[PDB]
Amino acid sequence: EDAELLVTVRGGRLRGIRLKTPGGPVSAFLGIPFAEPPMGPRRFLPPEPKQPWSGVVDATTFQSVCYQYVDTLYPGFEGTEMWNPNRELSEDCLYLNVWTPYPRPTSPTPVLVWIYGGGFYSGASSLDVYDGRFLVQAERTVLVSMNYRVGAFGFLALPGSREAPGNVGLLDQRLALQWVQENVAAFGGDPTSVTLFGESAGAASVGMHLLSPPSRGLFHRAVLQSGAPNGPWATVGMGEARRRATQLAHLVGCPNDTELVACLRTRPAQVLVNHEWHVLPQESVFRFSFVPVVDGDFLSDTPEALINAGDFHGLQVLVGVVKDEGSYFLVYGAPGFSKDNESLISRAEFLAGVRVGVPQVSDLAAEAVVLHYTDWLHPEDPARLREALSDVVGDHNVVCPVAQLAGRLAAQGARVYAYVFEHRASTLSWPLWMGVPHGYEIEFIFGIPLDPSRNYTAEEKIFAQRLMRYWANFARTGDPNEPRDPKAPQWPPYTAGAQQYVSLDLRPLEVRRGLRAQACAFWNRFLPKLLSA
Amino acid sequence: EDAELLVTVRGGRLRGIRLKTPGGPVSAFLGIPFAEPPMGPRRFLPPEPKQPWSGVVDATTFQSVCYQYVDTLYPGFEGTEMWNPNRELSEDCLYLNVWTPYPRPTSPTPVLVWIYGGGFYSGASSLDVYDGRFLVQAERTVLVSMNYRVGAFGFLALPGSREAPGNVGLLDQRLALQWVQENVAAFGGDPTSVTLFGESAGAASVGMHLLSPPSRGLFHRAVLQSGAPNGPWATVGMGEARRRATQLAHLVGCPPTGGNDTELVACLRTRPAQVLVNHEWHVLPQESVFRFSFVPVVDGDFLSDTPEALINAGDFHGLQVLVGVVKDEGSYFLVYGAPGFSKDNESLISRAEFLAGVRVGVPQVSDLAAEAVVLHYTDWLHPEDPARLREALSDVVGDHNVVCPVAQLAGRLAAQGARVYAYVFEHRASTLSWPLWMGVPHGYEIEFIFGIPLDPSRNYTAEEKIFAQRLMRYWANFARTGDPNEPRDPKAPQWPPYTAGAQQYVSLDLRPLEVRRGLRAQACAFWNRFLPKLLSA
Ligand SMILES: *[C@@H]1O[C@H](CO[C@@H]2O[C@@H](C)[C@@H](O)[C@@H](O)[C@@H]2O)[C@@H](O[C@@H]2O[C@H](CO)[C@@H](O)[C@H](O)[C@H]2NC(C)=O)[C@H](O)[C@H]1NC(C)=O
Ligand SMILES: *[C@@H]1O[C@H](CO[C@@H]2O[C@@H](C)[C@@H](O)[C@@H](O)[C@@H]2O)[C@@H](O[C@@H]2O[C@H](CO)[C@@H](O)[C@H](O)[C@H]2NC(C)=O)[C@H](O)[C@H]1NC(C)=O
Numbered sequence A: 001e002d003a004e005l006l007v008t009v010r011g012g013r014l015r016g017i018r019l020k021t022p023g024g025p026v027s028a029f030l031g032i033p034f035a036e037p038p039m040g041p042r043r044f045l046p047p048e049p050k051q052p053w054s055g056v057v058d059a060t061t062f063q064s065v066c067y068q069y070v071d072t073l074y075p076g077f078e079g080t081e082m083w084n085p086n087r088e089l090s091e092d093c094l095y096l097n098v099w100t101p102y103p104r105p106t107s108p109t110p111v112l113v114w115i116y117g118g119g120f121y122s123g124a125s126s127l128d129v130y131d132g133r134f135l136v137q138a139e140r141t142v143l144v145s146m147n148y149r150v151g152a153f154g155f156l157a158l159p160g161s162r163e164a165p166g167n168v169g170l171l172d173q174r175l176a177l178q179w180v181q182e183n184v185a186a187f188g189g190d191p192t193s194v195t196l197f198g199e200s201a202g203a204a205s206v207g208m209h210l211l212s213p214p215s216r217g218l219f220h221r222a223v224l225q226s227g228a229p230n231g232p233w234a235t236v237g238m239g240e241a242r243r244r245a246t247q248l249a250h251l252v253g254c255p256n257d258t259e260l261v262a263c264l265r266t267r268p269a270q271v272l273v274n275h276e277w278h279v280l281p282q283e284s285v286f287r288f289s290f291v292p293v294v295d296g297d298f299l300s301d302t303p304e305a306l307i308n309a310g311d312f313h314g315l316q317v318l319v320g321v322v323k324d325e326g327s328y329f330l331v332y333g334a335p336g337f338s339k340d341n342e343s344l345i346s347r348a349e350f351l352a353g354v355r356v357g358v359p360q361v362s363d364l365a366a367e368a369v370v371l372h373y374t375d376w377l378h379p380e381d382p383a384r385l386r387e388a389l390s391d392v393v394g395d396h397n398v399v400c401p402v403a404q405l406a407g408r409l410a411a412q413g414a415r416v417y418a419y420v421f422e423h424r425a426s427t428l429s430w431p432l433w434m435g436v437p438h439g440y441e442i443e444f445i446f447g448i449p450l451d452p453s454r455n456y457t458a459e460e461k462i463f464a465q466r467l468m469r470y471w472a473n474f475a476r477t478g479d480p481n482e483p484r485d486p487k488a489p490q491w492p493p494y495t496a497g498a499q500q501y502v503s504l505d506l507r508p509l510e511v512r513r514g515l516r517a518q519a520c521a522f523w524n525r526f527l528p529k530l531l532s533a
Numbered sequence B: 001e002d003a004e005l006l007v008t009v010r011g012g013r014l015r016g017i018r019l020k021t022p023g024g025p026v027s028a029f030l031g032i033p034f035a036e037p038p039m040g041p042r043r044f045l046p047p048e049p050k051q052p053w054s055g056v057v058d059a060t061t062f063q064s065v066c067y068q069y070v071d072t073l074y075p076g077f078e079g080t081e082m083w084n085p086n087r088e089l090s091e092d093c094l095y096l097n098v099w100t101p102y103p104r105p106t107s108p109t110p111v112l113v114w115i116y117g118g119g120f121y122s123g124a125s126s127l128d129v130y131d132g133r134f135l136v137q138a139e140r141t142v143l144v145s146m147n148y149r150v151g152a153f154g155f156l157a158l159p160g161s162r163e164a165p166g167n168v169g170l171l172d173q174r175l176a177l178q179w180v181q182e183n184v185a186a187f188g189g190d191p192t193s194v195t196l197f198g199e200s201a202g203a204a205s206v207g208m209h210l211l212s213p214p215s216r217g218l219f220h221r222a223v224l225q226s227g228a229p230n231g232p233w234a235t236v237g238m239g240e241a242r243r244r245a246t247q248l249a250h251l252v253g254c255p256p257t258g259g260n261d262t263e264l265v266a267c268l269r270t271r272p273a274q275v276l277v278n279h280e281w282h283v284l285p286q287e288s289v290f291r292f293s294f295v296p297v298v299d300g301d302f303l304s305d306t307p308e309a310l311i312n313a314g315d316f317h318g319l320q321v322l323v324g325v326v327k328d329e330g331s332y333f334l335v336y337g338a339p340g341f342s343k344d345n346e347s348l349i350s351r352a353e354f355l356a357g358v359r360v361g362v363p364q365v366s367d368l369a370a371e372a373v374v375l376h377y378t379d380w381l382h383p384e385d386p387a388r389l390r391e392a393l394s395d396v397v398g399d400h401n402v403v404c405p406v407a408q409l410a411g412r413l414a415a416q417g418a419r420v421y422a423y424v425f426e427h428r429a430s431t432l433s434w435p436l437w438m439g440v441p442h443g444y445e446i447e448f449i450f451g452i453p454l455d456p457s458r459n460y461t462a463e464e465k466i467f468a469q470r471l472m473r474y475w476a477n478f479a480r481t482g483d484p485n486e487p488r489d490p491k492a493p494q495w496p497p498y499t500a501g502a503q504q505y506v507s508l509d510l511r512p513l514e515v516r517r518g519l520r521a522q523a524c525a526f527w528n529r530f531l532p533k534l535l536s537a
């Protein structure tokens, strides 16, 4: 019997599994229960801590995926399926996973906690692309990822009611962070050196933990990839949440908050999923029904407000974007777009595309967007129009929110490092015109190119190893730079003035200025003043 | 007595003077009365045509300049004095000038009619830089210029009243234009080939004649230099006109606010002309050169709608138009009010002076609008670079007041039938006395169009003389044929028409013609397409 695979946590005993990598074995503990299953009466409720068990919990395989819509846009296509659930769906899904070196560290080891994206309507910790084994082996950290409830199960809110308070998915994440505080030491992890990182909605989640004081004492450093708590898609107000919760009820045959929630609890999970996407008239991936609610509790004010009022001395943040943040999203609602042709669009389509990428704003506001993003020497060139709408969508939802976060955190005391990820994966199944699409830096951070059963190049393995080092450096010291390394070019902190960031791809680090400063001035400075008066 | 200097017009007989030019002799008739003097009871009234006279009127020198404010910003400085009045001020000023070749043309000749600028508060046809002699000698055209009333005397309006109807300055111009149709044939000019041209307020004036049917009969082609009727400064609404007229009246003790129009105007008529001029600039709280009190009024008479509206609604087939701007339209204006500016230093302004400058140069807009302007003109990678800020404030003022109005006009005329030719004048004069940072300022293409470098007593370079001759050729070609291009010259670079799509224009300087696209297209999209929509909601 292998002693290294037996661990005792506060709730009881676990048996893990040894995993192989090209660099040696790694210990893994998969599908560890950290909450009581949020089913029946516990649906829509905050998570209850897992009650202690007797005997040995089998932790050798991934557990169920939280209930979510399954994307059927391009069935069988690698580019979409790689994000789809790869275990059966279940409300019994609150499990987390621990990877650790083999044999287990005997001195305290820095901990990385991963939070997946998926727009708050999907995601799972078991996707192949979030495989912890290569990071752990190469950089000898402990790595933890959790599942958290999404869609209505995670973020349906009837503000003020105890039957559906909202943000319980965020609370799932917090419970896992509490779990890591109490138990990571049993795996060799140092609970005083926890680094959060996430992508997209995961990045937004990280940011919200930064801004919610009960979470802030559960981790030390943060990494936000292609996402930010202050993006226009990541939060909803109390009044609008109540409307949305009520609309979902009517759509599924449900009629007093107590009576409403009780009825929702009688409906099968699949029923709620099937109506989730129909609660808003113009509902898309950038305007989903059930997202984090600003209700004074988890978030005392809006993330914009909390950021501006914050004192962020003592915080190191790693933030960044991919080269083409908007391109991926265009095939999910923008007219004229497909992965199977060049997606050259007409100006009429461009104007319509703008109302989709920037939903629920006045005609005046939409007019300003079209003004800024039209080349008036070439107002109707189809190739330029495709790039422009990609930029509109990318800048409004990802780049400029991240740029704002970086700027404000820096000016208010955080040490910030910014990057733009510019390498297109040799294995990328999306079309050439999409460039470096949203979410395709992840496989490199997790070192998936080291898996020889996949078809990355020798250059890409070296590239992946660089990135894992930057990330792990940051997790250990708060500085991505090779702690002592003279001649290799240095990654400078991002500041509100100089606005310096580095480009990540096969070439060495290149320092540049401005995360699309001209465009982000439009989105971050002017356009809000417009939407008011 | 010489027979070339004797001409009979409908009013009676005239005697002119023979002018020496470097390239030859020219006949000139300066100071022809085309209207009864707008004195006493006729102050603020439309011009009455000049009553016939017996005997011979000597048209041998420039007549008086219409009453106006005299710029004292930089006394003795040639850059400002060259625009100031160079005859005595008088309300008795409605005279025009004719230049014609020597000897008088035997077959009908193209007529260029010049309208001076000066923001509707100043100007005169007698300024040295408007001397018709070189254009006439070099290109064999008839050149005509008129005086027209300015400031309160031309444009004080109490709309609806008969005692101060408004736009009388424009009516002065129209009367001069009618005079040309009746009498220019007597000088060998062809009344069916008349080309209006003007600069700044002169260009705006030309544009308003385009949009006013009674005037539209009196000419055939148009040239608009650095100005347009849709500019934010060139017109005013009826109610605002009345408020301004009433305030001026109040500031001079009339009556001893508002009341009967007849009594109010009658009281105004008893004030000495100079008194009106001295109070004229204090009607508005923050008054400037791009916001003068008395300008043309939109009242349904001379202009049936706003110039913007009349343009869009217009059918301009059969019309040829030549339009343009100088390279740095906004710089000249910055030393007349903007914080941190002077002709005597580099005028490197701070971020705060820039924000303050925007409010001055784009007057009376909401804070939202002022914000929008600051956004578009800030380089957010270098938000506080004083040189860049200076350039940007110059661009703000220039784009708002000249370039984008001219661009809107060009595009809309081209789309709706007119053949349009467009230029950017990029040459800085060697004799220029304004500081080097102003680049090519507003109004400094005029001396080249009028061929002033050919005057030996001025110290231009030989290249500038060549250049002046090129421009005179273009303008005169446009006048003759409706196309500034060299008839039957093939190897010479061609000047293509301006259209809404291609947006092509040529650069004019010492080098040959370079064709370019877009008259500050990105900036003007902002000023012409978006910024009005924001003022509504
Ligand atoms: C590029 O493709 C889009 C998407 O259309 C789909 O994908 C194509 C490869 C082809 O298989 C089509 O038959 C598919 O429907 C085109 O946009 C569609 O245009 C059709 C035209 O009738 C319209 O009915 C659909 O609603 C459009 N779909 C979307 C999402 O807008 C687009 O026209 C193609 N570009 C071209 C042909 O230049
Ligand atoms: C650039 O000049 C302006 C104008 O000031 C005048 O002209 C100068 C060339 C010099 O002769 C000054 O002494 C003159 O007063 C300066 O702006 C003025 O500054 C003074 C004092 O600081 C102030 O009282 C005025 O109100 C200012 N006028 C305006 C229109 O803003 C400006 O500071 C100069 N810039 C320099 C010297 O860097």
Ligand SMILES: *[C@@H]1O[C@H](CO)[C@@H](O)[C@H](O)[C@H]1NC(C)=O
Pocket (backbone or CB within 6 Å): B260, B261, B262, B263
């Ligand atoms: C103004 O007063 C005059 C002088 O008596 C008078 O004739 C005229 O009718 C008055 N105007 C109006 C509009 O009543």
